[PDB]
Amino acid sequence: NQKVYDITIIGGGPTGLFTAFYGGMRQASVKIIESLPQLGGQLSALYPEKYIYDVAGFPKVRAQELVDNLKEQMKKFDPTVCLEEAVDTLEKQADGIFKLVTNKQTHYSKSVIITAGNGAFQPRRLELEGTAKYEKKNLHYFVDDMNKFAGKRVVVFGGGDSAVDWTMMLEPIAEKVTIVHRRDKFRAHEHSVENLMNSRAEVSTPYVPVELIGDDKIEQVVLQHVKTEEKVIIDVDDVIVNYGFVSSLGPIKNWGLDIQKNSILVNSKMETNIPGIYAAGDICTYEGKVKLIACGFGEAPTAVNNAKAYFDPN
Amino acid sequence: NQKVYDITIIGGGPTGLFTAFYGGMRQASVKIIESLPQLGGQLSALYPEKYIYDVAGFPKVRAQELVDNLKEQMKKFDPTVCLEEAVDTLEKQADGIFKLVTNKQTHYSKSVIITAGNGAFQPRRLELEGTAKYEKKNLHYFVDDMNKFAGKRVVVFGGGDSAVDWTMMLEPIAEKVTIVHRRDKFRAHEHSVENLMNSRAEVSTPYVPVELIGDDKIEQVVLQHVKTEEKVIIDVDDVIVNYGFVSSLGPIKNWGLDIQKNSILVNSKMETNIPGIYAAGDICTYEGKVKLIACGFGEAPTAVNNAKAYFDPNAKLQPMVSSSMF
Ligand SMILES: Cc1cc2nc3c(=O)[nH]c(=O)nc-3n(C[C@H](O)[C@H](O)[C@H](O)COP(=O)(O)OP(=O)(O)OC[C@H]3O[C@@H](n4cnc5c(N)ncnc54)[C@H](O)[C@@H]3O)c2cc1C
């Protein structure tokens, strides 16, 4: 958007959602940039169902059940949420405005608050050749709509819970749905795996894919047995990968921020070495910093107010 | 008894309750000392029924329900709860152990975390030493039951956070709820004033009352602007004063702690100037500190871990992930 905002939040993590809540709380046009197509950061991506106990007020809380509590607390102000954008450049222009260039567009902000935790959460890719031409066409890593694969032969890679449920959702939808894993025992919930055999889903296991046959759309996938090392091809139309999520800093170190051991040096005002750029959550660090969500929750409003004193004279 | 505890927490308020939980999170014998006869601190005593919205994770949670969610969260470690004790002396003896003397007995701790308010029980009123009879009847300072002001016309005097929210929570119950302040800007969070204007709650600008029409109960309040001197009478059933300019620290001032603005000055490690003494919540202060519950909850584990690293060297600062302790 060409409209410069007031606070642009790098990271849709738990610190980023609650900080987005506090932005409107001080009359701030709030913009969130997230590398994922989903909010939640580490919780929604790495452990959404697990119970967390050291969050203030929650003797027992699910990770994602708290995320919805943060999104609902946040939708009270409706910030401009720009998903599927990984911030690449963060540069201060001649007038103090920050120029943020992502993979989509360039966003502008009077101040930028970086709640990025450990890095950007782009999914785990493959380990083949330049599949970018498959990725732009029929090679997917996220499931937006499941019905787009109805009547098409679809292959699924992975063994986790995330992979098995996606396959079980394609049994009455996908023409031919096959799930591939490297071991005979799916690293998933046991009673959901039992339903996978009690369905029309072909279960190829233990297999690992090798060759992605397709001129530009993947139409055949060459497998290979873990023990006998025989190659088995199955004709496909779309390919779905669910191995898990990965994070990494990348361009974060090259933004002129004092970074030592993948953490931004911030003061008690949550101010980095760049005026107008603030950080909170686990991505920040200082004397006695404890990498917690409870601490990241207390670093968020401190970061909004000290930025409010940066871009708005009271 | 003569147990040299590990962490003795001054204050059974909301910040101290979460701090007591996180003490057990690092395997610390926890002692809580509270001047009130009840835990909850400011919440259980001054507004136990009101709804809180700026708590991380709770878009809308009741105050006492938040206290009970903390007490339920805390009883996982069963800290030593000493009620009705106001710490008078806090001295570090020759071996580093702190000696705490309350009105009752002498307690011991390896380290001390100060989460208490002031030890007292007083918001802040105006300057009339008469009218003493309205307070026993309809001039209130505290929200006990929300229904006692329901169906009654309630007028509120003040501009702080307490004045704007009480007016906003009396809007769907009280016939006429009015907020009166001595200044042109309600010094509150911006969206609580935004919700204050967008309702039937009558919003009185800077006014100062004159005539409390009543032999013992105020039934009409004749107003007066601080500068323009306009007379506005408002029919009321209850009269509410919500200034709340904090209050003096008291026995905290005599402990050798660097104090700025009735608040203990702490570093980013939540350390006071005394090694082994920590402070968090609204009682602590530093650069850009915001007197919030969101901040005070985030300052609490900062102090527990830095204290676990104070009295126990071979313990990692970064703790064990919470899921791996259940
Ligand atoms: C398995 C596990 C268990 C845990 N258990 C606990 C526990 O019990 N208690 C506890 O207190 N803490 C726990 N934690 C820690 C907790 O998850 C973190 O402290 C918390 O997530 C910090 O919030 P954050 O937003 O800074 O991190 P994150 O959730 O990592 O936020 C990072 C977000 O920013 C985005 N992002 C990053 N870089 C970019 C970029 N360049 N462009 C665009 N978007 C970007 C990412 O996509 C992501 O959404 C646990 C962590 C893990 C991994």
Numbering used by the authors:
A (entry chain A): 6 to 319
B (entry chain B): 6 to 331
Sentences from the paper on this structure:
Bacillus cereus (Bc) encodes three FNR paralogs, two of which have assigned distinct biological functions in bacillithiol disulfide reduction and flavodoxin (Fld) reduction. In this study, we have assigned a function to FNR1, in which the His residue is replaced by a conserved Val, in the reduction of the heme-degrading monooxygenase IsdG, ultimately facilitating the release of iron in an important iron acquisition pathway. The Bc IsdG structure was solved, and IsdG-FNR1 interactions were proposed through protein–protein docking. Mutational studies and bioinformatics analyses confirmed the importance of the conserved FAD-stacking residues on the respective reaction rates, proposing a division of FNRs into four functionally unique sequence similarity clusters likely related to the nature of this residue.
To investigate if the interchange of Val to His in FNR1 and His to Val in FNR2 could explain the differences in the efficiencies of Fld or IsdG reduction, we generated cross-mutants of the two proteins, FNR1V329H and FNR2H326V. In the case of FNR2H326V, the replacement of His with Val resulted in a nearly 3-fold decrease in the turnover number in the reduction of NrdI and a 15-fold decrease in the reduction rate of Fld1, as compared to our previous studies on the wild-type protein. In contrast, the FNR2H326V crystal structure revealed interesting and unusual features, including an asymmetric rotation of the NAD(P)H-binding domain relative to the FAD-binding domain in the two monomers of the biological dimer. Interestingly, the second monomer has adopted a different conformation of the NAD(P)H-binding domain, resulting in an asymmetric dimer. This conformation is more closed, resembling the low-molecular-weight (low Mr) TrxR structure, where a different conformational change is required for catalysis than for FNRs. Furthermore, the second monomer with the alternative conformation completely lacks electron density corresponding to the FAD cofactor and is, in fact, an apoprotein. In the conformation seen for the FAD-free monomer, the position conventionally occupied by FAD is not stacked by the C-terminal subdomain of the opposite monomer. Moreover, the total loss of the FAD cofactor in one monomer, and a 100% occupancy in the other has never been described previously. Additionally, the asymmetry in FNR2H326V indicates that the enzyme may exhibit a negative cooperativity with respect to the binding of FAD, possibly affecting the reaction rate of Fld reduction.
